[PDB]
Every structure is written in C-alpha cells, then in structure tokens.
Design an enzyme around this catalytic site. Sequence first.
Site, mmCIF file in Angstrom:
data_model
loop_
_atom_site.group_PDB
_atom_site.id
_atom_site.type_symbol
_atom_site.label_atom_id
_atom_site.label_comp_id
_atom_site.label_asym_id
_atom_site.label_seq_id
_atom_site.Cartn_x
_atom_site.Cartn_y
_atom_site.Cartn_z
ATOM 1 N N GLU A 1 -1.256 5.883 10.715
ATOM 2 C CA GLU A 1 -2.390 5.053 10.023
ATOM 3 C C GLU A 1 -1.624 5.013 8.545
ATOM 4 O OE1 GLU A 1 -4.212 3.135 8.080
ATOM 5 O OE2 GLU A 1 -5.910 4.734 7.490
ATOM 6 N N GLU B 1 1.606 -0.637 2.424
ATOM 7 C CA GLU B 1 1.638 0.810 2.091
ATOM 8 C C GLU B 1 3.153 1.502 2.542
ATOM 9 O OE1 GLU B 1 -1.645 3.118 3.330
ATOM 10 O OE2 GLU B 1 -3.053 2.263 1.741
HETATM 11 N N1 SFG Z 1 7.141 8.526 5.344
HETATM 12 C C1 SFG Z 1 6.224 9.571 5.355
HETATM 13 N N2 SFG Z 1 6.521 10.654 5.837
HETATM 14 C C2 SFG Z 1 5.312 11.504 6.055
HETATM 15 N N3 SFG Z 1 4.197 11.346 5.823
HETATM 16 C C3 SFG Z 1 3.972 10.046 5.281
HETATM 17 C C4 SFG Z 1 4.840 9.191 4.902
HETATM 18 N N4 SFG Z 1 4.319 7.906 4.517
HETATM 19 C C5 SFG Z 1 3.060 8.296 4.196
HETATM 20 N N5 SFG Z 1 2.754 9.323 4.729
HETATM 21 C C6 SFG Z 1 1.441 10.343 4.584
HETATM 22 O O1 SFG Z 1 0.572 9.515 5.523
HETATM 23 C C7 SFG Z 1 -0.866 9.635 5.184
HETATM 24 C C8 SFG Z 1 -1.498 8.225 5.174
HETATM 25 C C9 SFG Z 1 -2.901 8.413 4.726
HETATM 26 N N6 SFG Z 1 -3.570 7.309 4.093
HETATM 27 C C10 SFG Z 1 -3.694 8.500 6.040
HETATM 28 C C11 SFG Z 1 -4.302 10.028 6.427
HETATM 29 C C12 SFG Z 1 -4.805 10.325 7.736
HETATM 30 N N7 SFG Z 1 -3.813 10.098 8.747
HETATM 31 C C13 SFG Z 1 -6.021 9.445 7.808
HETATM 32 O O2 SFG Z 1 -6.099 8.621 8.633
HETATM 33 O O3 SFG Z 1 -6.890 9.985 7.227
HETATM 34 C C14 SFG Z 1 -0.698 10.303 3.835
HETATM 35 O O4 SFG Z 1 -1.218 11.495 4.168
HETATM 36 C C15 SFG Z 1 0.654 10.176 3.269
HETATM 37 O O5 SFG Z 1 0.970 11.133 2.376
#
Ligand code: SFG
Lengths: 318, 318, 306, 296
Positions: A116, A125
């Site tokens: 997500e 993003e």
């Molecule tokens: N390349 C990456 N590698 C690992 N984690 C990432 C990466 N890019 C973004 N994220 C993480 O992905 C998440 C995106 C969030 N907006 C969503 C959080 C969660 N999955 C939810 O739906 O509540 C954040 O916690 C970021 O730190």
Amino acid sequence: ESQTYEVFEKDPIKYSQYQQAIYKCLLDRVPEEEKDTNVQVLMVLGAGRGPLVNASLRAAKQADRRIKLYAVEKNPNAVVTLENWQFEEWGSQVTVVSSDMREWVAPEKADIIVSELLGSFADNELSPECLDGAQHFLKDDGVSIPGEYTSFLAPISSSKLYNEVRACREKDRDPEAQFEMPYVVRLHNFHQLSAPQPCFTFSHPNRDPMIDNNRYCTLEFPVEVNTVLHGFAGYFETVLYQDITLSIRPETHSPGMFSWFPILFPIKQPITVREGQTICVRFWRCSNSKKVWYEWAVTAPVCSAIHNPTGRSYTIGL
Amino acid sequence: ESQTYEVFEKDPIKYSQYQQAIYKCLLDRVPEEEKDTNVQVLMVLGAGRGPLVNASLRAAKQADRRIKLYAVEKNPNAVVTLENWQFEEWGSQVTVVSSDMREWVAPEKADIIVSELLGSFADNELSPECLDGAQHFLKDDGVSIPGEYTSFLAPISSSKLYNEVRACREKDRDPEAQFEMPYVVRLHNFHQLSAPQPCFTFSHPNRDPMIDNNRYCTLEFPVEVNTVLHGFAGYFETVLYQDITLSIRPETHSPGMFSWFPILFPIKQPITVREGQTICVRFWRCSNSKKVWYEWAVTAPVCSAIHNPTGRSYTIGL
Amino acid sequence: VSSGRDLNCVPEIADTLGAVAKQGFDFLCMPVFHPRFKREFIQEPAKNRPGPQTRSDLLLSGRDWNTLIVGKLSPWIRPDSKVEKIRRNSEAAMLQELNFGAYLGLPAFLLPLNQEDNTNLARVLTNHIHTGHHSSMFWMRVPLVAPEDLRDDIIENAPTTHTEEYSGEEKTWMWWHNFRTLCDYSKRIAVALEIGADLPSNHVIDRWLGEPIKAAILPTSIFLTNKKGFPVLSKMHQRLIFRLLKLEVQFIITGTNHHSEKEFCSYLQYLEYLSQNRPPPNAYELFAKGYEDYLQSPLQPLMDNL
Amino acid sequence: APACMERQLEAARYRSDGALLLGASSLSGRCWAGSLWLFKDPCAAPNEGFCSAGVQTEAGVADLTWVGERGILVASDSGAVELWELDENETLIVSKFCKYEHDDIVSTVSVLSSGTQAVSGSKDICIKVWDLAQQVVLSSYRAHAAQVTCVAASPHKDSVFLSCSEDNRILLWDTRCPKPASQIGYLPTSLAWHPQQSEVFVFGDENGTVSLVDTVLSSAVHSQCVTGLVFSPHSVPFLASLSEDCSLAVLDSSLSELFRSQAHRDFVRDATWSPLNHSLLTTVGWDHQVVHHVVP
Ligand SMILES: Nc1ncnc2c1ncn2[C@@H]1O[C@H](C[C@@H](N)CC[C@H](N)C(=O)O)[C@@H](O)[C@H]1O
Ligand SMILES: Nc1ncnc2c1ncn2[C@@H]1O[C@H](C[C@@H](N)CC[C@H](N)C(=O)O)[C@@H](O)[C@H]1O
C-alpha cells in the site's frame, strides 16, 4: 510518525478491500486438494505497523489456505511496533524484515507481494520504483496486489484555492515555488470544469525489457461554461485483484473510504476559458537516480510556462 | 567542460610526478627476468581526456615493462576525446570504458589503479567514495596510485576575504548561506595565524572491515599575535607512490605546480584573538547515500555556531 | 556586417572552417554530430554501437569553439513525434547534443521551430537550461512563411489555399510565441528568422518587431540574378535587410551556390555592399548609440542633488 | 583504391553479371566522407584488398543506384548528385559529373525507366528530375512540406515515380500532367513498385508496418522504422524488408513472413537479390557486415 499510521488504520474499508483481494487470490492459486500441503509465500512490502499483515492472516483463515508471511519495513520506528506484535501475537508464521524492499536479499521467492505505497495521485509516493526493485523475489507466476493503478486529472476553477496557494510564499526560496508543487487538499469551494481523464498507468509485475517509469501525457478537456482555470484536481483508481478495487475518482469513489483526499496541481497564472473551448494540459513524470517529479503546462486556450522544470521547486526523494 | 580539462593539462609537474610514480611501481612489481612475459593490468579511473593514460604509457616505456590499459570515464563528452585518441593513436593496448567506476563490471582484475580525483582539500571531490567503489576489481596485492592523501587547515585573518564572502549573499536562499560553504581561492591579502595542521587522512586500498569515510577532528592552533579570525585556509598532501608526492601545503608546496589553489572555510562572525591564546576548531566530514559535506565550528577562544549543519548550505553530490 | 555560413556537410572541420574564413565569414553553423548518424539509446544491439559517437573537441582550439562555431541540432531529432520510441530516442539525443555543445563552450546552438507543437522540445530545452549556467545562446530557427504555406501548387487533388487567412499567415509567430511562453521568457532563447523567396504581407513581417531576433537566415535560393550574373535581392528584400541591420542582427547564408558562374563569396559581397550603403544615422541616433533598450531610473532633481 | 572502407555501409546493388556495387560513409570520427566499391567476387566484400574497383568520394553516400551496367548515380551529403562510371577495364571508378543543386543533404535517388533520366529527393524539401546525358536539372518540384525520405521510379512508366515525406504525404507523379503530383497515420519511410503489376506498390512506415497499395493489406513486420523494401527477381516476387530494429524479413505476396535474420548488430541499410541465384539475398549494415542470406 506513530499518529500518521494510527490515522491510516482508522479506514476499515481499505483493509477489508485488501483482505477480500488476498482471499480471492489464495483460492485461485491453491485448490481444495492442496489446501493442507501447499503453503503460499506472502510478502507485505512496506508493512508499517502491521494492518496489512493482519489482513493477510484474516484472508488466509477466510480462504482456509496456508500462508508464510514476511513483513518488510524500512522505518525502524515502525519495526519496533512490528517486532513487538510478532513476539506477542504473530509468532513464527511472520518474519519481520527491517529493510528497504529494493535492497533486501530474500531467502525465498514470493507467490504474492502485498503493498500500500499509493499516494493521492497513485504513483506520487514512488510505488512503481519500490515495486520494480522488489519484483525479482516474486515467483514467475507470482501476483502483485495491487496489480495496477491509474491517476486522473480534471481542470478546476477556484479563486479561494488560488489565493490559498499564493499565500504559501516563503522566505529564502523562489518567490513563485508554491505554484510549482502539488497539495493534498479536501477541495470544497471550487468548480470542476470538465470530467476527469486518465493520466498515468502502472502495472505490477512490470514484464517489459525497457522498464521506464517516465511518462508524458496530453489531455484535452472540453469546457461548456465561461470560467477561470486555477489548476488541476488529481485522483486515482487501483485494481487490487480482479474486481476488488479502490478509488478516489468522484464518479467511482469507494464508499466510506477517507484515506486519501484529492491532490491539487496549481498554475502560476489564472487562465480565462470561454464556453465551447478546450483546455489542453501536458503532464510529465520525470526522474534521475535520486529524485522523481512532475512537470506540467497548459498549451490551450493559451500557453502557460512549464511548471516545476527539472524539479526546481518540488521533488520526491528516492 | 573541454576548457577545464585543457587547464588541468597545462600542469606538466603533476603528470611527470604521476609518470615517475607509475615507473617506480612497475619496476617493483615486475623483475628483469619477467619483463617480456608479465603484462601489468593498469586502470586509469577517471581518465578525463587521457593525460594519465599517456603518462602510464610513457612510464611503461621508461620502465621497459609491458602494460594493458583500461581508461574509465563517466563524462560522455570526455569519452568522445578518449575514443578518438584510442582509434587514432593508442590502439588495442587501451580499452576505453564509458562508465562510473563504482558501477563498472571489470573483465579482469588490476595490478595498478591510477586516479586524479583530488580537490584542494584532498577528499572534497569524493575520491574516497569513488576509489572504495572500484576497490573490488584491484588484485589482492594490487596498488592504488595515489596510495594516501591528507588535508591540512590553518587559521587566517583577512578583512578583505571576509568582505568578499559577505558580498556573495543571493536572492532566494538563506541570507547567511555564503559563510557556510568553502571557496577555492588564491589567498593574497591575508595573514596565516598559526602553522597548518593535518585534518583528514585517507588510504587506498581501504583494507578495513568497518569502512567509514565520516570523520571528526579537533585542532588546537597556538596564536602569537593579537588579531581577528575570519576563517580557515585548507591545503592537502598526497603520496602517489613511496617518495613521489604532490603538495599544496605552503611549507612542502610542489615546485611550479598550479593545478590547485587553496580552499577557504569562512566563519559567519569574526572572532577576536589575543596573543598567547589558542584557536580551537572542530571539523566534521559527513554523509548520507546521496551527499557528502563538511561541518565546522570554533570552540576557543569563543564559540561559533556550527556551520553548514546537515549540509543545508553546501553539499557534494554522490 | 557580422556574417555566418550555414552548412549541413562538414567532411573535415579545419579545411571547412578555413574555406569559410577565406570567403569572409565571421562564423560557421554546422552539425556537432553527423546529421544522418541516428543513435539508439534503449534497444540492443544498436544501443551498444562502438564509439566514438562524434568527432573530437581536439580538432579546434577552445577559442575557435567559443567564437567561430554555432552548433546545430541533428535533423532526425523529433521530441514531439507521435511514435513513443522516436520521442524517447530524440529526448536522449537532444540532451546529448546540447551537452556536447556546452562541453565545447559553443557561443550559440540552432534548434528548429518547423511545426506548431514543440511542447516536448521546449521541455527538454528548459531542463537543459536549468542544469548549470552556461550563458550560451539558443537560436530558434523559424521561417516568416511556414513550408506548408510556400509549397508549389502542383498537387492536382490537394490544391494550395487561395483564400486570405489574416491570422493563419501569422502562424509561425504563434509557434515562436508558444515556445518562449513554455520556456518562461528565458534570456538565453532568441530568434533566427528565416527569410523566404516571396516575402509575406507587411502585417506578418512586423509581427516580429519587438521580438528578440539575434540572426536572419538568407537562403541562396531567394536571390535574383542581375545583368552581370551576380546574386542580388529584390527592392522589398533590401528594405527588410535595412530594418534588420537597424536591430544589429547576425546574417546567415544557407544553401548551395545557385550562381555557379560566380564565386560563392558573391552572396556575402552583396550583403556587405548593402551594409556599406545603408541610410546614415542622424544626430539623435548617434547620441542614443549604446543606450538602445538600456533601462534607467528616472532622475529626481527635487529629492536628490544632481 | 582507398586503403580503408568506411564503417557505415549504406548501399548494396548487384548488376546483371552478379558483380556487387557497395556504398559506404564514415558517420563519426575525424573525416565524414564516403566511398564507392565494386566486387566481382561478392564473398570477398567488404575486404578492400579483394575489390575489383574502389574510389573515395568528397562527402558521405546517403544513397546510390546503378545506371545501366557501368554507371553509378550517387546522392551526396554535400547537396550534390554525382555520376560515376567504370572505365573499360572496370578497374577504376571515374567521375563524370558532380552537380550541387540541392540546398541540403541529397537523401534519395532513382533512375527512371528510360535509363537517361533520374529523380533525386532531399532534406531541402525539393524533388529534382535530371537529364543524365546533358548533366542538367530538367525540373525542380517543391510539392512536399518537409524532408523527402524516398523516391522510387516506376519499373516501365518513364514519366512516373513515387515520393514520400515527413510531411505525411505519399505522392504519385506523372510529369506528363500540368500538376504532376497526386496524393495517395504514421509517417511513410520506404517505397517499392511491384515489378509485374504496374498499378501496385508497397510502402513502409516509421512504426514498422509494411503495406500493399493498388492505386488495404498491412502487416506489423518490424519493431522500428522500415528503412527499405526490395522485391526478388522471381516470376512471383518475394519482398525483403529492412529496419533500424537491425533485422531482415522476407515476405510473401500476402505480406506473410517466410524468413527472418538477426545477423546484423547495427542498422540494416540495403538489400540486394543475386541475379545469378534468385534464392540469395545480400544485406549491408552500419556494423560493416556484408551478409549473404540463403532465403528458403
Ligand atoms: N522501499 C521501501 N521499502 C520498505 N518499506 C517501504 C518502502 N517505501 C515505503 N515503505 C513503507 O511503506 C509504508 C507505506 C504506508 N503509507 C502504509 C503503511 C501500512 N502498510 C498501512 O496500510 O497502514 C510506510 O510504513 C513506509 O515506511
Ligand atoms: N566515479 C567516477 N567514475 C568515473 N569517472 C569519474 C568518477 N568520478 C570522477 N570521474 C572523472 O574523473 C575526472 C577527474 C578530473 N578532475 C581529472 C581528469 C584527468 N584524469 C586529468 O588528470 O586531467 C573527470 O574526468 C571526472 O568525470
């Protein structure tokens, strides 16, 4: 921050959609005869505080199928939440990974990758770059949830929002920088001048030899009233799995889902538009090894300057 | 640009020093008995328009030893010069490589790596990062030319230079940004307040498991006159091979070499210094995955603010 | 008068420069990459074509690159092409050529405005400008009359428009105007105005009046032949040359020799004759010299002591 | 006889006895010139030490054509149309004329059915009809609005030829008419008249599609620009298609693929069918390869 994750977690519609998609994909990959022997490798890429990990677990119990989970998260503060949840509730079924998905060396290949990473303009993003970097540890017949996303644009009139953007001038920066950047905003006192049209589309996995996330789009908006163009409202749509979708585009807006407000792309100068005239806009998605950005210009009824050239006012860090 | 390379090429002392170093290293690696059978793999890393490639060839003819050359250059415009020189004069003995040395997959391992990635403060052009990335394609007993470099600092008084730096205030940026960045300058109307002292040192190859190019140094400068501190002059010294060196530090300055003028690190506020007092300065070399920068502060006789925190005013792109 | 020779064929740079200097030209507009040498940037095996990609910077001195050479964009570069593959190879090739020009320290670089839609060309140029300082000029090659509007009426089932289109005859001005609006009025972007055999109506010409014209391109084909067989211009073309001389534009001679019996330098000799025989300047034009479009604060003799 | 042949091979044409004419340019490095070569032993090509004849041209060769059995008509970068001729011994390629009539690079050239006239096309947007014996331009036409890409003279109609341009027009010409041109998606890039059916021609586009036009049938043959289209010498001809995608395709009557070759490492520039063995096809490319294909 912890409270931004808490705000994301308040949207039950978004996670119930993800759960339904995972539930449907698990039934298509593992038939009844294999249900007790076949263990599906599921990787949640950007697991945050874990709501998608819990959604995948509920989906597997619903599908009556066996899953092995990997929860990948780069934010070490969110990893504290994850490792505490893993020890107290999840157990050995979930392996918490403190890593950037693009740098991570996976022990196994995944049947399903769940993420997500979507913004209000879908790809803002950098979900394409992140998923492209993680693509190699997905099995050949592997599935990405989301499978696809599409951004949408619509021309808008709003003298209030033009005034609000204008007031964002800051000390120690270009005096017009505020007009060369998008804003997440719950648009209220405005007028949508033409129906939203697709802008950029991304698919996952990206089974193309010439992988290029750069894009150039030309949109023609028929206008039926006399007005002033102050900018462009942006929305998105995504396909999680088959018919399971998420949308913020007004005509298809997912009922009761508040995770994303629209995005606003302003213009430096208001543009007079006559009834019967076409608004023509050009949007570019640009990149280098360190940054991603948007560039935009109006070419009809009159030309604007190219907004945010070389990402001088606004960039998205890689 | 082409004319910057032409200016570098006008310094014969620098290339004759490189040639002498390569000549000495070739005799130490290959004895007389092996001179006709043993072919030494030499890689010029950042070959520019080719003067180091020609210096390596002259060195091999002088040493009466056989060499195989690779000329690595990331600048595609300099690669035009290189590929034309290769076809017209060098021939098969030289393989021109259009690549970043950190990204390049080498077909063979090198006996000697030759480079000239040094700034006026030695490591300010990111020679440590570049060479660290190229280190893997050097043989276990492999030599790096340069083998080592050391930067030097000296406190200076100059009311003219303080005024010159002050006048570098620009529109659309922090009003004091000009004091938080170094300047390459032929220092003239100034006063050196204490003898130069070593600041940062780098060695090549870097045979350390915990490779960290970040540094923190504390320098104590005894002052024998009443004065005003306006900044710090920076110089460097390098060991090409054994006793073959290059220096811009005034007491050891390489005769007739004009490739590097000193560097100036200003301070935002002039500091009164009494005779008998010690000037204490702290310099940091900092980094992230995308940028490298310096941070500095005076702690004695009085404290200054920390200059260029987080590289807000000045960075060196990776 | 400051003159340049436009060529699209340079077998040897030193010999061409030398022959062009012998003719009396102050500079040469030439391709910096072979105009037919289309390059691939994405698809194998053609992306891996062995170098050199062009000729060496070492063929001329730095002073010669800085003063005698105006660079030219390759004619196959089409950033606004409807074929995505052509558009992407063209963007990468445009950057590569502009970057080689900046590497050479070229004083100017020619880019055409030969169609209405140059949005992507504008975008690639703006990104190039916002990568360093350079100070280097970009001369936009735009004709007074569009090529579609000067074609011979020789297509039996597609005749030329014999109807007066006031705003349509002014279409090339709108191509320039949209381009410079997109590029946000950059001081580095100017006009290289191409003069045709038949001059358009007055209104079409004076549309360019307050526009930043830095060069005027004269094809050898627009010249008439006088009694002695030398190339000359019509009285109306002479009137336009005199207006352009008042703006101190650089004159560019393009095309092959169409007066074979005569030396090619005769085109330039004629131009130099018109420059020498221009109407002289008055006592005001003589006083005002050096102050043309130079902005000054109005004097305040009450508030300040002069 | 030049000591070295330029890397970028531009043209390959067999004459009646099976001798192969080659056209080359240097599109990079110090000198941007060209050369013309004759190989009575096509297997020996492009080896300079094994040619029958060879000569250096002033500028690059963008296109060429045989004029009978000894004439060589060249489209030059200089804006000139050049006529070369083999001496009595066919050991020397000698200049007959070099007329600088075009204002930009001469991109295309074709001999009309009479064998005494030629048609040239240029980046200068003009089409010219030449009298080869008088060494003069009979007519200069400015029908197009952009660069002329290809000119193809009718097999048996003396006053008839095809032209295509970046202005998106395919023009059918008949110089017997007061208005000689007649206009017949993606930009047209290559043309070939059918050798037997007088009213039929094929055209290629910038997107890789080959189409059949009977003054329609189309096939997506290449992934890039269709550089050339060459019919075989058979009673029932086959069509050779060559592209910037670095491949050669041999097509049947209904544009269906029969053969495919990925032999070239760079752009495929010309294709020529042997008069001796009709199943043999020679291609030249910018990779400096002279390939002999055995078409099944
Ligand atoms: N390349 C990456 N590698 C690992 N984690 C990432 C990466 N890019 C973004 N994220 C993480 O992905 C998440 C995106 C969030 N907006 C969503 C959080 C969660 N999955 C939810 O739906 O509540 C954040 O916690 C970021 O730190
Ligand atoms: N990581 C890198 N990979 C390849 N080349 C590099 C790298 N970093 C710098 N360079 C090149 O190294 C050169 C450094 C020059 N200042 C010296 C040029 C030349 N060796 C001389 O002594 O004249 C430039 O041509 C850079 O483009």
